[PDB]
Every structure is written in structure tokens, then in C-alpha cells.
Amino acid sequence: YAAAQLRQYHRLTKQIKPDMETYERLREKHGEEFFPTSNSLLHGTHVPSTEEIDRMVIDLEKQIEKRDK
Amino acid sequence: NWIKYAQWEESLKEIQRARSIYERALDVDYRNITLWLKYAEMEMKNRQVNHARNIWDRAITTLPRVNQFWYKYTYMEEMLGNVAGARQVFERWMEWQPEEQAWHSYINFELRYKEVDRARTIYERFVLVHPDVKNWIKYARFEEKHAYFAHARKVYERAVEFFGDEHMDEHLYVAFAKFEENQKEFERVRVIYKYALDRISKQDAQELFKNYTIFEKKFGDRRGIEDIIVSKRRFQYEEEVK
Amino acid sequence: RKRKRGVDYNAEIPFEKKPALGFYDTSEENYQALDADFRKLRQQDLDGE
Amino acid sequence: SWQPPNVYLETSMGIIVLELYWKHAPKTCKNFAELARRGYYNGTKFHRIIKDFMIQGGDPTGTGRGGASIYGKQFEDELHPDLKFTGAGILAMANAGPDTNGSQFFVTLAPTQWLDGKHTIFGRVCQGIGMVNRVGMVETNSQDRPVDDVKIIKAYPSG
Amino acid sequence: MALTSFLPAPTQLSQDQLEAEEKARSQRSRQTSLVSSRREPPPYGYRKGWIPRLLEDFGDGGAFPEIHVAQYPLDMGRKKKMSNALAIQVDSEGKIKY
């Protein structure tokens, strides 16, 4: 199951890859935050925007739609 | 049976009842991987991101070896663009020293965002946790591709120091010969091949010989090319004679 | 009704073990109630195909 | 009778630096710097931490009953009409009543109004205020005692 | 025995390496030139007449008792909503107590 999941993972990560703009926009303004360690206090404070959540749900469906086959 | 009941409440959108079914089901067999997945999926769909976070965070503490949870959690943060938060999940994962493939996912994460110098530092940590010849070649070729040859050589020098007194794989020396070939240090290349040929048996060293004989076909004189080939043939004919 | 068990599952969440709760606040976020639509829904539609 | 600059705390969690007003309460400041100088806080802990109120700290007994001074167990107050308990991160001398101050300070976490009736302010925190909040997020009990040790490692009356 | 004793020390460098050594050294120097976030100014030392109003003014933080305005560094001391999150508690000098 691991290997097919890995193949899935390689497939999913390559499809998110063209979204460079949101990364580039974030990196300047959030560069003071962009590099945290495991002990940094950022965990528990991140409130994502609704549109990002929407993108996740749609992409989850794409995983399900593959899983359907 | 629990999953069927929870999915039926999910169809009725009675999320507060569905939540309680999953929690009660964990009390009977918390180790069932598929149970955690179904619970976390249901919260994500309904945009209840903070509920899903609490489910993932509980899951990695109780079941650290279930690799699938880590991948899915990062995948949530990556889709949300929380590149910072994703790292924290990755960093806490590396504390447990997971399997090789996990590291490569973390390496590729930095590589997707072109953070070459960070990828280097992770490579150094990775090679120390997983001291396998394959990882050293990967690291060395990485520096080589970006033309940081002063770094790449040191990686090769440390590799032949580390393995050389314990085990000697031809794979490293063929790679390191190609480095000095790019450096055009043909004298260094010949030293590398001789050092390998004097210790590795001629019957395993055929691919060693094959690259070397091609190497001499690129830059060596015809006399030098024939002698290395004749000595190989002499060994072959001696095997025929034996 | 002359029974000691049954009708209790309609009054409340029967065995409400709460979700565990920590590091993210989530007393705030809450969910849209079920769209009823009692002019098209059927017994076959709730169970599914 | 010399006037050192800013006092470096070196807690278990990190560094915190206190600023002290030689303008308004010099006697407490000399006392606080001297106890920091001799090493009277090296190993004392934040024994009483009330969430969103204050952090009482500094006692070799660790009880919240102990402490002496360089004058001996007591000295007067310096209830100055300028300093007012306003916001988090004020440093102040913990009290047991009128004109009785030992060697227990407390760093404050919220605006408090009844406090400046009966306590002496001398100080405010100026370096790594978030680390104070991390001390603020420490597990408590019925008597508001930490489970782990939040102790001050070393202290320097630097400059 | 390692090739570091069988290969000469890097006194052997082709012209391509000479150019590449200067290029690789400069590339390291260029990648660290990203200064990132320029941080806030510290407050004034002779605080007469100054009043902090923004979060920026605090800089390093801490409230000023000699300035008679209600201060809330890092939103501390403000009346918080009923949050059900248990405190993100951190041990003495270790990692966050998950």
C-alpha cells in the first residue's frame, strides 16, 4: 500500500507545483516567520483563508476520484 | 460497523453525532489506521480545519510509525500554503528518525521552493542518519549540478575516507572518476581507477574496466588504451587456460 | 410506550464523548445545519443507491 | 553605592533583561542589583504563576514565605506617584504588607488597578517579552505551582 | 586507506575549475545577501511626551509604567474570548510539551 500511496504522493505533489505565485507572495511578507523550528510558537495560531480550504476540498475529491477507479 | 453508522450521520450532516461515534470507536481500537483517516476526512470536507488539526496532532503522538498520517498532515498545510507550519510537522517527524523516503519528501519540499542551501543541510543530516553509499552519490551529484565543485569534492573525499576502510563499492569510484573527468584531472582519474583495480577483483571490475577503457578512449593515447585492454584480455585468456 | 430502551436516541446525542481539544481553539467554528428539503427527499435517497 | 545598568536574567527558558529606574526607587535597585551580583537568585524559581496576573519569583526557600534583604528582612516602601500598574511586563517588588519588602519580585502580565495601592514598582522588562508569555503558559495547580522547574539559572548586573 | 593520500591536494586545478571556484565562492556569498525582514525601531530613552499607540512602538516589547496610557504588548492583557484550547505549555529548556 505504501508504494502506491508514494506513487499517489508523487502524482499529487507534482500537480500542486505550478502554484508558485502564492508561495512567492508569502515568502517576502512572511520571511520573518517563513523559517520556523519545531519549538517555535507558530503552531496553533495559523488561521487559513476560506479559499485555501476550498482548494483543499476540491483536491481531496480529485484523490477520491482516483481512488474510485 | 462503526464506520457505517458514522457515514450515515455524515449523510444527514449531523456532524455532532458523527464526531461522538468516531471518538467512541477509538476507545475500542485506537490502533486501526483507517478509523483515524475517516474521522479526519469528514472534518476537512466540512471546512472544520481546527477539528481536523486536533485529530492529526493526536494521531502522530499515539501512532508515530504510521507514515501515512505525516504525509496527509503536511499535504493539508501545503494546500493551505502554510509552508512554515508544514516544516514544523516535518521537523517533529525527523526527531523520530523515519525511513529514507520520508527525508526525500522533506528534501524535495525545499527543492520545490529552490532553497538549495537548506536542502544541503538536510542532506548532511540525512546521510548521518542513513549512511548508505547511494545517499553520498546523491548529495555529491547535487553539489556538482550547481557547479559548487569545492563542496562536491569534499563530499567525495569524505565518502572514500568513511567507506574505504570498511567496504569498497565500485559505484562511488565510477561517479568520482566522472567528477574529476569534468574537472579534466585525467591524472587523478587514472589514480582512482588503479586504486580500485588493485583491490577489486577483475571479474567484478568489468563495469569499472568498461568506463575506464572508454575514459582512455576519450583522452588516453592508443598505446595506453591497448595495454589496459590487453591486460584485461590476458586475464580473460588466462581464465580460458585455467 | 412501555419500554426501558429505544426513544433515548432521539432526545440528544446518545453517548456524547466529546472530541479532544487542544493547541487550536475550536469553540468558535461551527457547521451549517442539514438542509431539510421535505418535498424531494425519499427513503431511498437517505440510504443511497 | 554604585549604579549598574540593566539586569540580565538568565532563566531556564531563555534570557530576559530588566530595566531599572535609578530616577525613582534607587534603594530597591541597589538591593536588587546586589542580590543579583552576589548570586542570591542563582537557582531560585518562579514559584507562584497566576495566569493573566503576574509571576512571583525569587526565593532560595522556594516557598513564597522566604527571603531576606541586604538591610535584613525588611525595608520601607517607595510608593512613587509616577509609576502605575499598566500593561504587562512591569517589574515590581512583591509585598507582605506595609513597609516590608524582602527579595521577591514579580513581573506582571495584565493591567491591574488595585495593585499600585500597596506595591512598589521599580522596573520593566525590555528584551524578549514573548519568553515572559512562555513562562506565562506554564502548567499550574490549586496553589498555582508549576510542575517543572522554571528557575533562574544566573543573573548579571551588567554594564 | 583513502584516495586523499593517493590523490594530490587541490594544487591541480583546470582553468574551468579556477573560474568555477570563484563562481562557487561568490554564489555562496550571493545566497546569504537576502537580509529578509528589517525589524522595528526601539523606543526612545528619554521618554518625555512619547505615547505608544501601535504594536510597532513596543519594538522589543514591555509596557512603560511612566506613560499613563493602557498598553497591550503582543495583545497580552486584553480580554480574551472563551477559547477551549489547552495552553501550549513548554518545558524548562526542552521542546514544547506535546
C15 Cβ under 8 Å from any chain A Cβ: no
Q: Which three cell numbers stand for residue B9?
A: 450521520
In a domain, B233, yes or no: no
Chain B interface, best mutation among E3, E25, E83, by max B CB count within 10 A: E3
Could you give the CA distance from residue B215 to residue B213 in angstroms, rounded to a whole number? 5
Reduce the DSSP state of residue C31 to 3 states and report it: coil
Count of residues making up chain C:
49
Q: Which of residues 24-43 of E touch B (CB under 8 A)?
A: 24-25, 27-28, 31-32
- From residue B103, how far is each of B56, B60, B70, E75 by CA, in Å? 20, 17, 12, 38
Experimental method: cryo-EM
B125 to chain C, minimum CA–CA distance in Å?
A: 29
Task: Look up cell 522589543; give the residue.
Answer: E60
Q: Are B112 and A64 in contact (CB under 8 A)?
A: no
- From residue A43, how far is each of A37, B82, D148 by CA, in Å? 10, 11, 22
Q: Which three cell numbers stand for residue B5?
A: 453508522
Least CA distance to E93: which residue of chain A?
A: A39
Q: Element (H or E) spanning D130, and its range?
A: helix D129-136
Q: Are E86 and D140 in contact (CB under 8 A)?
A: no
In a domain, B72, yes or no: yes
A43 Cβ under 8 Å from any chain C Cβ: yes
- From residue B231, how far is each of B68, B189, B191 by CA, in Å? 54, 19, 17
Count how many domains chain D has.
1
Reduce the DSSP state of residue E39 to 3 states and report it: coil
Give the pairing of strands D120-127 and D15-20. Answer: antiparallel
Dihedrals φ, ψ of D94, to 5°?
A: -70, 145
Instruction: Please name every residue paired with D106 in a beta bridge, in sequence order, or none if there are none.
Output: D56, D92
Containing domain of residue B76, as a range? 1-224
DSSP annotation of E56: G
> Is-catalytic flag, D106?
yes
Count how many domains chain B has.
1
In a domain, B238, yes or no: no
Q: Which three cell numbers stand for residue A11?
A: 502524482
- Nearest to D43, CA basis, from D156, D128, D152, D159: D152
B50: buried, middle or exposed (CB in 10 Å: 19+, 13-18, 0-12)? buried
Least CA distance to B39: which residue of chain C?
A: C19
* Interchain CB distance below 8 Å, D129 and E62: yes
Q: Which chains touch E (3 or more CB pairs under 8 A)?
A: A, B, C, D
SS3 string of chain B?
A: CHHHHHHHHHHCCCHHHHHHHHHHHHHHCCCCHHHHHHHHHHHHHCCCHHHHHHHHHHHHHHCCCCHHHHHHHHHHHHHCCCHHHHHHHHHHHHHCCCCHHHHHHHHHHHHHCCCHHHHHHHHHHHHHHCCCHHHHHHHHHHHHHCCCHHHHHHHHHHHHHHHHCCCCCHHHHHHHHHHHHHCCCHHHHHHHHHHHHCCCCCCCCHHHHHHHHHHHHHHCCHHHHHHHHHHHHHHHHHHHHC
Amino acid at B114: K
Residue E11's Cβ-side half-sphere holds a number of Cα atoms within 13 Å equal to: 3
Residue among A31, A39, A44 whose CB faces E95 most closely: A39
Contacts with E41 (C-beta within 8 Å, 6 or more apart), sequence order = E56, E59
Chain E interface, best mutation among D139, D140, D144, D152, by max E CB count within 10 A: D139
Could you give the CA distance from residue B226 to residue A53 in angstroms, rounded to a whole number? 68
What is the distance in angstroms between the CA of the first residue and the CA of the last residue of chain C?
Answer: 34
Could you give the CA distance from residue D100 to residue D75 in angstroms, rounded to a whole number? 6
D111 Cβ under 8 Å from any chain E Cβ: yes
Instruction: Please name every residue paired with D125 in a beta bridge, in sequence order, or none if there are none.
Output: D18
- Nearest to B110, CA basis, from B99, B123, B98: B123
DSSP annotation of C35: P
Count of residues making up chain B:
242
- From residue D56, how far is each of A58, D49, D107, E27, E65 by CA, in Å? 52, 6, 7, 52, 18
Active-site residue identified among D20, D35, D91, D115: D115
Chain C positions touching A44 (Cβ under 8 A) are 23-25
Q: Which three cell numbers stand for residue E96?
A: 514544547
Reduce the DSSP state of residue D65 to 3 states and report it: coil
> Is-catalytic flag, D53?
yes
In a domain, B115, yes or no: yes
Could you give the CA distance from residue E57 to residue E77 in angstroms, rounded to a whole number? 17
Dihedrals φ, ψ of B37, to 5°?
A: -55, -55
In a domain, B186, yes or no: yes
* Interchain CB distance below 8 Å, E17 and B191: no
Task: Look up cell 510537522; give the residue.
Answer: B89
Active-site residue identified among D9, D18, D48, D83: D48
B81 to chain A, minimum CA–CA distance in Å?
A: 7
Chain E positions touching C24 (Cβ under 8 A) are 85
In a domain, B237, yes or no: no
Q: Which three cell numbers stand for residue E39?
A: 525589524
Dihedrals φ, ψ of D157, to 5°?
A: -80, 70
Contacts with D9 (C-beta within 8 Å, 6 or more apart), sequence order = D15, D16, D17, D18, D152, D155
Q: Which chains touch D (3 or more CB pairs under 8 A)?
A: E
In a domain, B240, yes or no: no
Dihedrals φ, ψ of B99, to 5°?
A: -50, 155
Task: Look up cell 488539526; give the residue.
Answer: B53
Question: How remote is the C-alpha of B178 from its chain's centroid?
Answer: 22
For chain A, the 3-state helix, strand and coil shares in percent, each to the nearest 5, are 60, 0, 40
Count of residues making up chain D:
159
Could you give the CA distance from residue B91 to residue A39 in angstroms, rounded to a whole number? 9
Chain E positions touching D148 (Cβ under 8 A) are 91-92
Residue D98's CATH number:
2.40.100.10
Q: Which three cell numbers stand for residue E32?
A: 546569504
Give the neighbor-by-neighbor strand order of the sheet with D54-57. D48-50, D54-57, D101-108, D90-95, D120-127, D15-20, D7-11, D152-157
* Interchain CB distance below 8 Å, E88 and A44: yes
Q: Which three cell numbers stand for residue B77?
A: 498545510
Q: Which three cell numbers stand for residue C31?
A: 457547521
Could you give the CA distance from residue D123 to residue D17 in angstroms, rounded to a whole number? 10
Containing domain of residue D74, as a range? 1-159
Chain E positions touching C25 (Cβ under 8 A) are 83-85
Dihedrals φ, ψ of C20, to 5°?
A: -65, 155
For chains A and B, CB pairs below 8 A equal 70
DSSP annotation of D16: E
Reduce the DSSP state of residue C32 to 3 states and report it: coil
Dihedrals φ, ψ of B95, to 5°?
A: -55, -40
Q: Which of residues 54-93 of B touch E (CB under 8 A)?
A: 57, 61, 92
Could you give the CA distance from residue B53 to residue C36 in angstroms, rounded to a whole number? 30
Could you give the CA distance from residue E65 to residue B77 in angstroms, rounded to a whole number? 41
Q: Are D136 and E80 in contact (CB under 8 A)?
A: no
Least CA distance to D126: which residue of chain E?
A: E62
Chain E interface, best mutation among A33, A37, A39, by max E CB count within 10 A: A39
Task: Please work out, in degrees rounded to the nearest 5, the angle formed at the alpha carbon of residue D19 by the alpha carbons of D14 and D21.
Answer: 160
Task: Count the Cβ atoms, other than its own, within 10 Å of residue B128.
Answer: 9
In a domain, B202, yes or no: yes
Task: Look up cell 508549576; give the residue.
Answer: D146
Q: Which chains touch B (3 or more CB pairs under 8 A)?
A: A, C, E
Residue among B13, B50, B58 whose CB faces C25 most closely: B50
Amino acid at C21: L
Q: Are B170 and B205 in contact (CB under 8 A)?
A: yes
Contacts with C8 (C-beta within 8 Å, 6 or more apart), sequence order = C14
- Nearest to D126, CA basis, from D48, D18, D50: D18
